[PDB]
Amino acid sequence: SLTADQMVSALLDAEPPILYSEYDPTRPFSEASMMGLLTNLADRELVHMINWAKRVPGFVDLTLHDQVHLLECAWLEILMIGLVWRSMEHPGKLLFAPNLLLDRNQGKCVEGMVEIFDMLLATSSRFRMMNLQGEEFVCLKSIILLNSGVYTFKSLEEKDHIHRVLDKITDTLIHLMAKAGLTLQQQHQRLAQLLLILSHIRHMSNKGMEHLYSMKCKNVVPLSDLLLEMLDAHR
């Protein structure tokens, strides 16, 4: 029951803050040190995401179990697309925090981290090339929340609802593009271009998911109980 502007302002107001890390650029980084920072940062961002999730239009209308499922499935995705968005105007770098700006080379301080870095860097580069807007960003982030877990689900009639708001965010995305002065064709193509990114973001999430799972088994740095919970939803 919202206009697209009402939809956008709803999303823009719900935006989680940019957090800092306890990182002190006076000493270099090891494997466990950089791991402690990123996972501590991810845990604190997780808390904000949950309260952000409860503000995505229509998310509250879902039952507590479905709310849990969607967040369980898309938390690392939503996490990553936030990073990619922050690191947009820091080419070749990843802005995990305003005080934590990292290099591709610094990603080699951790086994197998550099591979995921390049993918994140490539996505950030892509957002830069497409010149992604903040209004478009908050839409995609909401799409990931509603879509990434909607398949892995009787009575229900709730999936039908999830696709309804999903279709509404699609309408919202198109309104933005049409407002921007894009032709009908340019809107279709840009819409397609955006939603194809989410396929790559899902891929980074799955690769990222298995990575810090190895860390849990390799026992390098302790992980917060909330983080281990989100990680166990992915086996």
Partner: peptide, 9 residues
Amino acid sequence: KILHRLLQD
């Protein structure tokens, strides 16, 4: 579950 709790708040 923590998520189970954190969403209920």
